[model samples]
Every structure is written in structure tokens, then in C-alpha cells.
Target: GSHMKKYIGIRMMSLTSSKAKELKDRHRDFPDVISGAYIIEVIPDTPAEAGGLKENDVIISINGQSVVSANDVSDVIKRESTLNMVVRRGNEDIMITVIPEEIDP
Candidate 1:
């Protein structure tokens, strides 16, 4: 059996620079303004994907706070159990909900 100690089904990277550039680009309005944790990959059928989150999306806030760092996101996700994510995608602002589930080892 194989499993991870902690998993959120989202592959996220800390946004340095920080790129509100977080991830989504080209399609962003005033792309100059950048910062947030970048979502680079989303696992299929996982909470992240189910939440309507997509690769290249940037997490600008969680429940209305600028906690865009990787650790911040992780901590909040774990504590909240359910997440209301404010994401920036292609010049659009979207809110996606997530409920993390555990995998049996």
C-alpha cells in the first residue's frame, strides 16, 4: 500500500516575484500585477479538479485573505477541511469550493 502523509490533490508551487503571475498569463488583464500560489497541476477526480480548479490557475486568496504562499495554502486547506478559493484564471476571477478527502493506505 502506498499513500502520502498529507495530500490535497493539488500540485502547487509558491509564487515568488510573486507572480499573480502566480500562474495564469497571457490571458490576464494588466498582467503586471502578480502574486499568489501558482497551481501548476491538478489531479483528476481529486478535490482540486472537482472544485473546478485548473492548471495555470493562481490562488489569490482563501476565504478572503492573501495567503498565497505554499505553506499558507496547505495550512489553511488542512484546517478548513473545506475551502473557498479565490482564483485568478485568464483575466477572470472565479471562486471554487473544495473538500479534501483521505485515501486509504
Candidate 2:
């Protein structure tokens, strides 16, 4: 019984295709496509910012799944409560684990 674990949290965020396209264009000049849901802003002291996620960081993948668009990111997070996000900042590739907490809908 002690080893049995149950219950999990679910959280989701919405983003528009227009915004995703804009971000993709802005960072297209970079060496890598930087494809995925890019972080344009990070709330101060929030999990994203605390995880070293910065503005313009490209989220390449989540939980080993390739991220092609913002919607992809949202979908993966919904499917998996926990995610291992691969972000590309310039020439470096950094991985961060994100455990989403439920928020008031």
C-alpha cells in the first residue's frame, strides 16, 4: 500500500496559431529552426522562469515527443502530467522537467 501511488494534476494553457507563427518567424534566422512552442514571456518567479526558461527559448520537444507547434506542446502536457522539455537557447540545448499544477479554469 505504501508503494501504491494515485492521483495526479492536470493543467493547460492556450495559445493562438497567429502568435505561434509570429514567434517562428522571429527566431527563424537562428541556425536551428527552434521549432516548437517558444517562450515569449515568463512570469516572474514562476516555475518556467525558475527553471531557467527565458524569452525566445524554443521548446524543441516534450517528454521525448517532437514539438512542431504550440498546440503540440499543450497536447503533450495534457497527455503526460510530467514533461521533459528540450529547449534550444542559441547553440545550446537545455532540458528541463515541468510538472504542471492545476489552475482555476
Candidate 3:
């Protein structure tokens, strides 16, 4: 049996203290959070970049579920066809919509 997988083309890292501090220094309105998935890379021509998800954007939530780590994001992305994401970019909370491309078996 083969299953289709959704691809958004992003690489994420778990938000560590050092990473959180980096964001806090750059963005005044950065949320006080101990955990989240930090978007480290947005691949070109992919759903992530097309939806305005850039590098260094911290993903706070997905589909109303809090994202605590890269693993959390991984679990959500595989099952969801569309993504409603709350991203922290600079001083603003941005909502990004991504329609993931399906990978054929």
C-alpha cells in the first residue's frame, strides 16, 4: 500500500533558548514561548515560499494546534492538505496559507 505525502518544502528546527533570544532581540512583539518550530529554510518555488513563509519565521501554531517542536510540525503537515499557520515575523503575527503539493507514490 502507498500513501500520498504533502510537501511544503521547508526545514524546521526546534526553538531553543538561544534562538528565542535571537528573535526577541529582533522583534519587539515576539511572544513569550519556550517552544515552537523555527523555520530555517524555505525552498524556492514551493508552497512555503509561495505562501510568504520565509526563513527565520517562527511557527506558533498550525490548524489551531500549538507547535512545540519540529516533530510536531512534521506530524501535522503529513495529514493536512491545507495549512493555516500563525507565524511570528518581526513585530507582527502573520497568517500564512499553504496548499501543500501532494507527492505521488
Candidate 4:
């Protein structure tokens, strides 16, 4: 099978202790969702970008499941590795599949 290009890497922020505790508490019941919500700032020339997942797009769900928190999103991404993400752009719902690649050291 052929491979596809990965998007530009993202820099995630570290949460404060209180914020972390809140996130953990909120998402404890739903471990499949991502946590520590953040917006996409820049999308490179890749499938995600081509599919209309742009900078400032807030990811709302993955494969139809709501992302209740940022940790939820991260957990989903880590567990699934590749996933179909649904983002909210104003009132529009955009879906895009993300396939993450291993970064070489």
C-alpha cells in the first residue's frame, strides 16, 4: 500500500495542576475522548489540510464521538493513532482523517 504525508507537527501546552485535575475528573468516565482542547493553528499540505481542517479549527469529535475534554482527544489519538476527526468551523462540521507518523530522533 502507498503511504501519505503527515501534517506539520503541533506543539501542545502543558496544563496547570488545577486544570489537569479538572480535566482528569471531567473525562474519567469517558476515557475515549481527547482532553486539553486546543485549536489547529496551521495545517500543512497534507490530507487533513486538504480535507479542510485548517488553522484555528476546534476539534469537536472523532468518528462521531464528542471530545469532552482535551485529554479525551489526546487519549483517542494515542489509542487509535489514526482517526477521523470532526471539527467545528463556525456552524459547519468538517470531518478529516488524521494519520500520525512517527517522528525520527
Candidate 5:
């Protein structure tokens, strides 16, 4: 049995307090709860790229549930093929919906 799941190809990092403060100084509209994951990489031709996910975007929620870490995103993606992500890019909020390719054995 293989533990395969859908792959969106978006690499992210957990947002810590220090990072939050650094970002706060840069972004005025940074969220108060700054425990979400931040997108660090987006692979070409993958669901993330097709979904318009970009590097530096901060993920706030997935499927309406708040995301606190990289594992939270991985958990949600493992359960569903389609996902709706709310991300903060600069000072604006963008909603991205992606139907990722399935990885199966």
C-alpha cells in the first residue's frame, strides 16, 4: 500500500513571531494571527502554478479552515483533490482554487 496524495507543488514555511514582526514592518495589512504558512516556492506546470500561487504569498486558510503550519496544508491536501486557499499577497487578499494532480501507486 502506498501513501500517495495529490501534489500541488507549493513549498512553504511556518510563519513565526519574528517573521511576523519583520513582515509587519514591511506589510501594513499583515494578519494578527501570524502563525500561517508562507509560500516559498511554486513549481512550474503544477497545480500551484496553474492556481496562480506565487512565492512570498502568505497562506491564511484552506477550505475555509485556518492554516497554522506546513503540516496543516499537507493534511488538508491529503484529504481532498480540490482545495481553496486564501492567501495574502502584499496588501491584498487572493483566493486560489486548485485541483492538483493525484500521485498514486
Candidate 6:
């Protein structure tokens, strides 16, 4: 068995809610759309960093698939070499592309 692992060096969690609506109330333009992977960290000197992804960026989608859970993101990372992501930051939704680094173990 020869399988390689790929990663972009970002940690995230699934979040359907929690003060997001409150935030939307404060900011009229903020997306109140629930369900997303909330990015907690982007490891230093990694593809995530080089790709311009930042901490606290909530990932809304990858490729064209919706990101409701970490698995959605992980599946893409493992299955594809290039990552096209849509992340919600502050009050705006931005797109970014990243290439994961393959690792053999």
C-alpha cells in the first residue's frame, strides 16, 4: 500500500451558528448564512499562509462544494492538488486558491 497524504496546514471546525446572527445584525452586509467551516489557525510557512488565508477565516466552500464540516475541506485536500476556496472574513466573502503539499509517510 502506497498512499500519500496532503495538507495545506490549516485547522478548522464546523460551526452552524453562535453569535453569527448577532454579528449580522451589527453589520448589514455580513452573511448570515449558517453552516460553514470556521478556520481557527493557519500554520506558519505553509501553503495556507502563502495562499493568503488567514486565521478566523470561515470557509464557505471549496471548489463548488459547500463546506459544512471539516471533512468537506479535508476531502478536497486529499482528493485534489489545487484548492479553490471561498472564505468569509469580517463582512466580505473572498476567494483564494491554494496548492497542498504532498507528504509520504
Which structure among the candidates has the greatest TM-score?
5
Off by over 4 Å in 4: 1-8, 12-36, 43-51
**lDDT of model 2 at position 53:** 62
Residue 46 of model 1 has an lDDT of 87
| RMSD (Cα, Å) of model 4 | 7.8
By summed lDDT, which 10 consecutive residues of candidate 4 come out lowest? Answer: 3-12
Candidates 2 and 6: which is better by TM-score? 6
- Inter-residue clash pairs, candidate 3: none
Give the candidate order by descending lDDT: 3, 5, 6, 1, 2, 4
All models: lDDT? 0.70, 0.59, 0.80, 0.55, 0.79, 0.76
| Highest lDDT scorer | 3
Between the candidate structures 1 and 3, which one is better when assessed by TM-score? 3
Model 3 regions more than 4 Å off: 17-29, 89-92
> 1 or 6: which has the higher lDDT?
6
lDDT of 2 at 23: 54
lDDT of 1 at 70: 83
Q: Write the per-residue lDDT of candidate 4 for residues 9-81, one digit (tens) a residue.
A: 5433334456556556865632343343455454475545555565544466676576755566666655566
Give TM per candidate: 0.71, 0.63, 0.78, 0.51, 0.79, 0.76
- Candidate 4's error at 93, in angstroms? 2.3
User: Candidate 6's residue-wise lDDT over 48-101, tens digit each?
Assistant: 999988885678777777777676778878888778898666577788999998
Supply the TM-score for candidate 1.
Answer: 0.71
* Predicted candidate 3 versus true structure: per-residue lDDT over 32-96, tens digit per residue: 77688887888888989998778866787887788888888887888777789987555777788
TM-score of candidate 4 against the unseen true structure: 0.51
The parts of candidate 1 lying over 4 Å away from their true place are: 1-6, 18-31, 89-92, 103-105
